[PDB]
Amino acid sequence: AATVYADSTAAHADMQGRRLKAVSDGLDHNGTGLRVIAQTQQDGGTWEQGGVEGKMRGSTQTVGIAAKTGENTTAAATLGMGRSTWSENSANAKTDSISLFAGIRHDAGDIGYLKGLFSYGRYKNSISRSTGADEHAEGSVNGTLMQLGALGGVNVPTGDLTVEGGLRYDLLKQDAFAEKGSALGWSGNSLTEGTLVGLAGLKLSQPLSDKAVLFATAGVERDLNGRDYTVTGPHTRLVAGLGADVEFGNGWNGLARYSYAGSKQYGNHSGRVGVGYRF
């Protein structure tokens, strides 16, 4: 039972979906010219993954730009470096990751929009697992995760209700690996796994003034097919959330988001602070 590799990979993919959310949220904010954006997203939950409880923690720094590329078009490109962990009985794991995120949002005048999202990242999972009495196995595995996203949104309003919904496809290719350091060390084969995710969501923006807005978010998210990262060697979550963009003046804006995702046997706190500069 090397469930620790499946689980850490799963924990990374799950974090990656929120990283993509953040870049896609960055498509909405834009007014005038071109923004440059620096962000920290922290993550923190527990997760029973088929009999095994674990604890994920995660930190991601991102730098990004977004800009009106057209009278009705917005584009964003973000670069993200992540460090996350995953714990279990007997074993824990640290994931390093480097990811590029890209998004385009086309508006149909004021009635709604479509978004395309894409991401390519690499990851490295370092596992150590107690295998005995002061005996550990160390194991190192690389993978690639790609995401593709299509969302449509309408924009009904006294402040603003946007409804938003679509799909995200996660393609994970993970390399073969082998553990050093133990006589009951384990090897595992490469793994390709593609998962469609359905997404649906509500954003209630209320502007406070000319220089600040607060939003509430409620959302739904569910794998539409299998998401098995068990190497050879599906529940709906509700997410509720809060936010606030503020214009500090002289080009600078700030950003605060907090979010909780839940299903049976899953719970994750996601937070986010961003500082921004509009040229």
Q: Which of 197, 193, 189, 187 is nearest to 173 (CA)?
A: 193
DSSP code for 224: S
Q: What are phi and psi of 6, to 5 degrees?
A: -60, -45
User: Among residues 122 and 211, whose Cβ is nearest to ligand CXE?
Assistant: 122
Q: Which of 48, 12, 256, 232 is nearest to 122 (CA)?
A: 12
Tell me how crowded residue 151 is: count the other CB atoms within 10 A of its CB.
Answer: 21
CB of 87 vs ligand CXE, minimal distance in Å? 19
User: Among residues 78 and 270, whose Cβ is nearest to ligand CXE?
Assistant: 78
CB of 35 vs ligand CXE, minimal distance in Å? 12
User: Among residues 95 and 195, whose Cβ is nearest to ligand CXE?
Assistant: 95
Quickly list H helices, 87-148.
Answer: none
CB of 83 vs ligand CXE, minimal distance in Å? 5
Question: Helix, strand, or coil here: 19?
Answer: helix
User: Among residues 64 and 139, whose Cβ is nearest to ligand CXE?
Assistant: 64
CB of 252 vs ligand CXE, minimal distance in Å? 18
Residues near ligand CXE (CB under 6 A) are: 59, 61, 63-65, 77-79, 81, 83
User: Among residues 125 and 217, whose Cβ is nearest to ligand CXE?
Assistant: 125
- Alpha-carbon Rg for the chain in angstroms: 20
User: What is the Cα–Cα distance from 96 to 146, expressed in whole angstroms?
Assistant: 16
CB of 70 vs ligand CXE, minimal distance in Å? 12
CB 119 within 8 A of CB 99: yes
User: What is the Cα–Cα distance from 136 to 129, expressed in whole angstroms?
Assistant: 5
User: Among residues 65 and 196, whose Cβ is nearest to ligand CXE?
Assistant: 65
Burial of 274 (0-12, 13-18, 19+ CB in 10 A): buried
CB of 9 vs ligand CXE, minimal distance in Å? 19
